[PDB]
Amino acid sequence: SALFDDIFTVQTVDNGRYNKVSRIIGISTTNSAIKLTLDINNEMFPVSQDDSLTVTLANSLSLKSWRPPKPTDKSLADDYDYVMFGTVYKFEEGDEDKIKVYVSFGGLLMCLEGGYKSLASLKQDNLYILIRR
Amino acid sequence: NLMGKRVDFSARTVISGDPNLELDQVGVPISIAKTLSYPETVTQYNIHR
Amino acid sequence: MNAPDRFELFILPDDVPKLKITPDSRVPNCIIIKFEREDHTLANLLREELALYPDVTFVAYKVEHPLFANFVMRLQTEEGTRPKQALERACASIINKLKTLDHKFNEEWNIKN
Amino acid sequence: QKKAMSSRAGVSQVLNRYTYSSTLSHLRRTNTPIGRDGKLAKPRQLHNTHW
Amino acid sequence: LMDDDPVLFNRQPSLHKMSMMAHRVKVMPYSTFRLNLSVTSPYNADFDGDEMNLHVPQSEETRAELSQLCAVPLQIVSPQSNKPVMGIVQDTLCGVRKMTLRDTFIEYEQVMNMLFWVPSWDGVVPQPAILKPKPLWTGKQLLSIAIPSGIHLQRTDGGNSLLSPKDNGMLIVDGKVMFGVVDKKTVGSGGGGLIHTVMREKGPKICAELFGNIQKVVNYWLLHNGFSIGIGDAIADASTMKEITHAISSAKEQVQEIIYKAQHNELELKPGMTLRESFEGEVSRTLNDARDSAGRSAEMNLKDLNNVKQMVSAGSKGSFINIAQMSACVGQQMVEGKRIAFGFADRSLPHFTKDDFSPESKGFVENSYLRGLTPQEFFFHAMAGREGLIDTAVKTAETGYIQRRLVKALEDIMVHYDGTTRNSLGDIIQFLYGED
Amino acid sequence: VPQIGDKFASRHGQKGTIGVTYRHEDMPFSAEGIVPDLIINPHAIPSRMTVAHLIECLLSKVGSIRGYEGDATPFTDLTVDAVSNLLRDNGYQSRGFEVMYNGHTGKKLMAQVFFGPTYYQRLRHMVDDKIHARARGPVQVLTRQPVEGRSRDGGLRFGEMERDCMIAHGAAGFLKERLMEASDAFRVHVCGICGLMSVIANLK
Amino acid sequence: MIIPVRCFSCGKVVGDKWDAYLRLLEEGKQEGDALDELKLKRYCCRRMVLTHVDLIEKFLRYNPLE
Amino acid sequence: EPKVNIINAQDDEVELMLSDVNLSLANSLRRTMLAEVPTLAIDLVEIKMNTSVLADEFISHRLGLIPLVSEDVEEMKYSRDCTCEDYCDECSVVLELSARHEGEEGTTDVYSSSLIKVSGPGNLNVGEPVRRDDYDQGILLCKLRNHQELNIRCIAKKGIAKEHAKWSPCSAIAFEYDPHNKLKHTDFWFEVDAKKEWPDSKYATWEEPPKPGEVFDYKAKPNRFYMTVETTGSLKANQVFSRGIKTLQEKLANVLFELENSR
Amino acid sequence: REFKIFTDVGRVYRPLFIVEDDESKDNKGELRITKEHIRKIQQGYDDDVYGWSSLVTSGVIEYVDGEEEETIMIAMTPEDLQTRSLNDTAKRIKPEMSTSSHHTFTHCEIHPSMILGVAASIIPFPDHNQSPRNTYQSAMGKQAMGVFLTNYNVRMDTMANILYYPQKPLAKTQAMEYLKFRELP
Amino acid sequence: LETDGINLAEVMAVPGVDSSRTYSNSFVEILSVLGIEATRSSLYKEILNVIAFDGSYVNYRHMALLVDVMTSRGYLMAITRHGINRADTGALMRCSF
RNA sequence: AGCAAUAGGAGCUU
Ligand SMILES: [Mg+2]
Ligand SMILES: [Zn+2]
Ligand SMILES: [Zn+2]
Ligand SMILES: [Zn+2]
């Protein structure tokens, strides 16, 4: 029920500009040349260098007016630690097999490279990102 | 007296700022709102008022 | 010369109701309440009490102008529940909490002697 | 009195009693009767010798 | 006089057609007039004593004329420079800059209040940017709620990428902010910004309501966040003070070297310019660059939590020169284009020696306002401020005369139904208006 | 009694009028319960560069805490650092910032607020001495136009530049109505042959 | 003119402390210590008493005209 | 679940820690005690002969600002809900002040202790101007020289601080929570380090400082509130607190009543 | 090569300290006023009424008009009379004054704040403001409600405003002791 | 080249000068030498220079209208009483100015 | 159902 499952190894984390927000860069451990840049809330999901993150991209959390979740219901986000919602604002079907996707998580930005055969299904309107560890 | 002249039905007072007014709204003091007037012809849609 | 009276904050006229309820038709099972002659003291108390109930989906208030002593409150609830009953429930809960607080303060003050 | 024109105006003024410092300042005021007929900004300038 | 009556509202002097505009009435106590704060720019008004005039139309033709030609929403874009004249100002700008920072998050209850505060909210709670472990909204979402849908804006600031490491540039898709701090470059009165776009796409009414939506949301957020400024916001740390004073000392040495070169007759003149005027121009260049460099040091020292820096970065008040003069160096004072003249015999003040051309003698203020001016610097700065006040007082009469003569010269000129531009005699001034 | 629209100033060129008044419970408070008499806007300091205003607030706070009068004579060896040292020795944040709470919610403010005593002045310009409206009233004998003066119940001048602005707006009817029906409109009879106002008219 | 009854900022009653403050000042105690003993702890209350100027003494010197 | 822990308790002030309550509740209590607790204050002054140097409305303002004993003011009625014409005995308290200087040297001070209660809804213990001790001289009202006289008939009525500050039972309600900023509700301005440059709260030692190894908690809400109520002597501190609670209770009961009786 | 003596009426003048400038005694280069003069001023008499005029006639203060001011070298403060040997990042840098090898001062300011007038003397820390704001305060302070006179009750004027509860300022200038701003705030 | 002083006709003739591009900042000289349309162009250039000196931008049509009114009669009509009141318009307009 | 004019001076906001 997910669009892009993968495991990433965090390379650099520039806390830097902000206080609650850090930008991370990570290459997939199983399929290199897949790069991931992602802004994350430090206070909600602190991340250190060389850590290993299971990163999921999904078009839904199921298995239009936001209401707080009950304990009794279940969704895909129940198995993860950090879930964000975003808007795809650029799909770069560019060079030979460089495909860049741009997602805006309320101003927290993400970029995802890789071959076309990995990110072809990532051409949507809105995307969820889920993270473990 | 010809290029410019004094006119009736005018008012003047200090201005203040109001974050809660709309852009095309002006807040008018009650005393000025009662001193100034508008002539409204009586018709069959506004006679009760 | 244009200053209104300082007692119109609290003295209710005879032609002005204390409370007036209208429904918000845009979203289901929501109501708009205007409290006349009240201010942040009651509004914030009620808002933060109601915001912690599971069955309350939306609750908010505003004082559109500081020079007028009223506030308006939007409250939505789930399908089965009615926002009015939740409003009475919140009022009763705050009343009970204040009664317990008063009882404990009086006992503590007596013990301090 | 009959030569009010060609005579200096404003040589005497009503003492300002709005507040005490206003009175103290009015009693120490000075006026150069250059007049406003003329846009020479030079005599209006704070000058070194004013120190 | 009753609510929603159109009345003509006016402040003198009425320099352009947007100094007198028609407003809708709302009756209030407390004998002042009340204005929304975004219309204070076309009137050139503020709230420190000003008075404005109100004219009541006495017939239906004049009511309709006011409401359909002079109404405030219709004057947002001006023909003077084909750009908007009303913008977001003076606290909503600073607050929206703070609110649309990348690391600004809002909990559910404050989000709920801000949504209810929006007059045009459609009753749909936006999904939070973060869903786990705690629902958090970013300020960009709450500001995008204010913007109407169907608006697209894109701006690049110094070649930023679509991933915007600095959170610069601007991207708006269907009325939602993807990245970019919202500051003067987006909600100001400049051309091509958000206000101009909404005016051109949606009309004057929706553009007028945009001001109110943004003002209300940002004002609530700033009320519950807070914003202040103190004596500490003008203070730079010790290392920056060392850098600033070193730069000023280096510039003083440079000026002393220029003086030595001029006195031993080895300075290189410039075309159409005397040796003394060349010396003065070079010294003025050096001291202006000294002040600019010290200001740059002070600006780099300021943290992102510095309140002066936040106000400057938002563009709502102050600029880099203000920071420089408060924290680093007031710099050189000019009277009538030159440095401080030798009002005494061969000196500026009787505390100096004869023929002393050093920066301090001829009106260089080495201190900042925070540090305090010396009596000499105080007097020189007083001369400069007096020159400014005289200029403001004296040029306005020439300007008003010029504008009256221009109006009388051009008062009878109208575009006619055949496209031509003719005067009252019927004579052609242009065969097509604006040539387009 | 001071009200909305009265003009007040501090001793550093910082003039302003009252925009609104809040009661004791509505105003922001510090943890000691101190509330301000007056809340001015931060955007008046940077471009006006009235640093003396902030320095004088800090000195006044220290003087009121230690029970003496601060010396603010110009061109003395006093510094902001010494004042901040005194203030910190008195148990307050050395830069005059305080943690204040929102009066409406009691929640802390995310930003700290520059807080302390300052000497303000009550200027002679009161709104109640300026507010004037006129519907109809006395006219001049000679011109039959509204008289001049607030005290005389006069009217406001619709001068030449107001006419220019109305011309730019293209509001011809409004301009005619300002200059005729809101002012000295009259009726005269002319001779259809000679075009002079030498017509003797007996209307009854 | 005459000592205000309340503190402007917070409303503590200071009108019953002016005479005690003057008595404290006669025996040499400096202003801060006198304000401390009168239990004025907030600087608003302190500046209420510390900055009062008693002008009624000057007004009372002109003979009553009745 | 709500809890109270009194830390200091005397007649004029009470210092207490409030816990297990929402911040809105604590702030509503602070606001109610500041603004909506009824007291008694002079609301109508009648001058018979005032030949003092002070003006009539100056003296009237000062008399209105005089604290009066208001212990029993809750058994009294607002002067706008009584059938009576010009003040009766049950919705008002009438005071008299007579002062006079005889002789041609010295100044006679007119104090608030010179106010004399004449009528009032007995045997209710309302009306008297508040004295700190048995030997208190009260508030300074005016000063008198030779042959100058003051003859005043004051009326005292029931009111709240919303209408006018003279009805406020409280001076300053100190109020704070979370001395160590564990919730990160504030964001400290600093030059070098925010921990050195900011003084500790007076209740810092009442809570454990955060450990260096600790991570931020996003579940913690404010739960302990330290507040110090002070009074002007018109009401006692426990009375101010209890009647603020009761006034809030009756405001909520009024809302509930309107809701139920709107069906 | 001219010597001009003026005894005209209407010349504006101001007092200065007299620095001893005779180049023949160890008393050269410092102020002629000493601690005996201040002791006499506090005493109120000389040790075999001692006021300002006695200082003027003893040759320790003199008056100078604008023309005479052309020929003199005024030290700003009594410390400027001697070059100091500092490095205080807080106190303002007193100007270097390095071009001139040896200063020969003839006068010293009594106090530099005396250049201001009556209205500008109310301003606290006027050297931390941009000059237009000082000018606006100089204009606006004359419109400030206070107590113009203590006999306002036996006077009959067209208009009068009296503040109910005037307060002296918490931050005060030395000049206001002479302007009575603390006596009639 | 830039110069002080003005002699347009003789400098335009000097060999080595681009005779088709010499320009003067005195548009009365332009009118005497180059005609009225070149005078209009020069007038617009001067007005644009004066306004845009400080970074101000006035839309083209306003300055175009101002220079077209000043060159409509074939000669330069100054914005003064000596220019405005020498027109053929009605007496009441001219007197009102 | 009816409240002078002309001057000078000081100020307010640009
Ligand atoms: Mg203004
Ligand atoms: Zn005829
Ligand atoms: Zn106080
Ligand atoms: Zn009764």
PDB file of N, CA and C in Angstrom, chain D residues 11-35:
ATOM      1  N   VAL D  11       7.071  92.069  17.715  1.00  0.00           N
ATOM      2  CA  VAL D  11       8.132  92.385  18.666  1.00  0.00           C
ATOM      3  C   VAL D  11       7.680  92.113  20.092  1.00  0.00           C
ATOM      4  N   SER D  12       6.391  92.254  20.367  1.00  0.00           N
ATOM      5  CA  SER D  12       5.797  91.871  21.638  1.00  0.00           C
ATOM      6  C   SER D  12       4.814  90.735  21.423  1.00  0.00           C
ATOM      7  N   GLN D  13       4.819  89.773  22.339  1.00  0.00           N
ATOM      8  CA  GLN D  13       3.964  88.610  22.208  1.00  0.00           C
ATOM      9  C   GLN D  13       3.353  88.292  23.561  1.00  0.00           C
ATOM     10  N   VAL D  14       2.221  87.600  23.528  1.00  0.00           N
ATOM     11  CA  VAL D  14       1.548  87.202  24.758  1.00  0.00           C
ATOM     12  C   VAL D  14       2.359  86.108  25.434  1.00  0.00           C
ATOM     13  N   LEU D  15       2.765  86.356  26.676  1.00  0.00           N
ATOM     14  CA  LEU D  15       3.603  85.408  27.395  1.00  0.00           C
ATOM     15  C   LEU D  15       2.901  84.057  27.482  1.00  0.00           C
ATOM     16  N   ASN D  16       3.620  83.003  27.112  1.00  0.00           N
ATOM     17  CA  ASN D  16       3.085  81.645  27.090  1.00  0.00           C
ATOM     18  C   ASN D  16       3.131  81.063  28.495  1.00  0.00           C
ATOM     19  N   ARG D  17       1.958  80.822  29.079  1.00  0.00           N
ATOM     20  CA  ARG D  17       1.847  80.286  30.428  1.00  0.00           C
ATOM     21  C   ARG D  17       1.241  78.891  30.437  1.00  0.00           C
ATOM     22  N   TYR D  18       1.404  78.138  29.350  1.00  0.00           N
ATOM     23  CA  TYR D  18       0.824  76.802  29.307  1.00  0.00           C
ATOM     24  C   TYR D  18       1.491  75.882  30.322  1.00  0.00           C
ATOM     25  N   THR D  19       2.818  75.902  30.377  1.00  0.00           N
ATOM     26  CA  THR D  19       3.567  75.184  31.390  1.00  0.00           C
ATOM     27  C   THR D  19       4.782  76.016  31.761  1.00  0.00           C
ATOM     28  N   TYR D  20       5.494  75.582  32.800  1.00  0.00           N
ATOM     29  CA  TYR D  20       6.539  76.430  33.359  1.00  0.00           C
ATOM     30  C   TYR D  20       7.713  76.549  32.396  1.00  0.00           C
ATOM     31  N   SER D  21       8.123  75.434  31.794  1.00  0.00           N
ATOM     32  CA  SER D  21       9.254  75.474  30.880  1.00  0.00           C
ATOM     33  C   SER D  21       8.912  76.261  29.628  1.00  0.00           C
ATOM     34  N   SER D  22       7.650  76.226  29.197  1.00  0.00           N
ATOM     35  CA  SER D  22       7.247  77.047  28.061  1.00  0.00           C
ATOM     36  C   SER D  22       7.399  78.527  28.380  1.00  0.00           C
ATOM     37  N   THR D  23       7.076  78.924  29.611  1.00  0.00           N
ATOM     38  CA  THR D  23       7.289  80.307  30.022  1.00  0.00           C
ATOM     39  C   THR D  23       8.773  80.643  30.041  1.00  0.00           C
ATOM     40  N   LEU D  24       9.583  79.755  30.623  1.00  0.00           N
ATOM     41  CA  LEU D  24      11.017  79.999  30.691  1.00  0.00           C
ATOM     42  C   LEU D  24      11.637  80.094  29.304  1.00  0.00           C
ATOM     43  N   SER D  25      11.131  79.320  28.344  1.00  0.00           N
ATOM     44  CA  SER D  25      11.664  79.383  26.988  1.00  0.00           C
ATOM     45  C   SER D  25      11.198  80.640  26.273  1.00  0.00           C
ATOM     46  N   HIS D  26       9.917  80.986  26.417  1.00  0.00           N
ATOM     47  CA  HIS D  26       9.403  82.198  25.798  1.00  0.00           C
ATOM     48  C   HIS D  26      10.135  83.431  26.294  1.00  0.00           C
ATOM     49  N   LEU D  27      10.557  83.430  27.555  1.00  0.00           N
ATOM     50  CA  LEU D  27      11.296  84.578  28.061  1.00  0.00           C
ATOM     51  C   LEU D  27      12.723  84.654  27.533  1.00  0.00           C
ATOM     52  N   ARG D  28      13.201  83.632  26.822  1.00  0.00           N
ATOM     53  CA  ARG D  28      14.571  83.607  26.323  1.00  0.00           C
ATOM     54  C   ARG D  28      14.631  83.458  24.805  1.00  0.00           C
ATOM     55  N   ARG D  29      13.559  83.809  24.100  1.00  0.00           N
ATOM     56  CA  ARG D  29      13.446  83.591  22.665  1.00  0.00           C
ATOM     57  C   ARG D  29      14.037  84.750  21.873  1.00  0.00           C
ATOM     58  N   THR D  30      14.386  84.461  20.621  1.00  0.00           N
ATOM     59  CA  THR D  30      15.061  85.408  19.752  1.00  0.00           C
ATOM     60  C   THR D  30      14.445  85.302  18.364  1.00  0.00           C
ATOM     61  N   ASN D  31      14.468  86.404  17.619  1.00  0.00           N
ATOM     62  CA  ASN D  31      13.811  86.454  16.319  1.00  0.00           C
ATOM     63  C   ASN D  31      14.661  87.303  15.391  1.00  0.00           C
ATOM     64  N   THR D  32      15.057  86.749  14.248  1.00  0.00           N
ATOM     65  CA  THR D  32      15.706  87.546  13.219  1.00  0.00           C
ATOM     66  C   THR D  32      14.668  87.983  12.198  1.00  0.00           C
ATOM     67  N   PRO D  33      14.442  89.270  12.014  1.00  0.00           N
ATOM     68  CA  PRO D  33      13.343  89.741  11.164  1.00  0.00           C
ATOM     69  C   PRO D  33      13.720  89.765   9.686  1.00  0.00           C
ATOM     70  N   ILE D  34      14.297  88.660   9.216  1.00  0.00           N
ATOM     71  CA  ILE D  34      14.625  88.525   7.800  1.00  0.00           C
ATOM     72  C   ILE D  34      13.346  88.533   6.982  1.00  0.00           C
ATOM     73  N   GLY D  35      12.346  87.802   7.444  1.00  0.00           N
ATOM     74  CA  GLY D  35      11.125  87.604   6.702  1.00  0.00           C
ATOM     75  C   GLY D  35      11.176  86.387   5.800  1.00  0.00           C
TER      76      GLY D  35
END
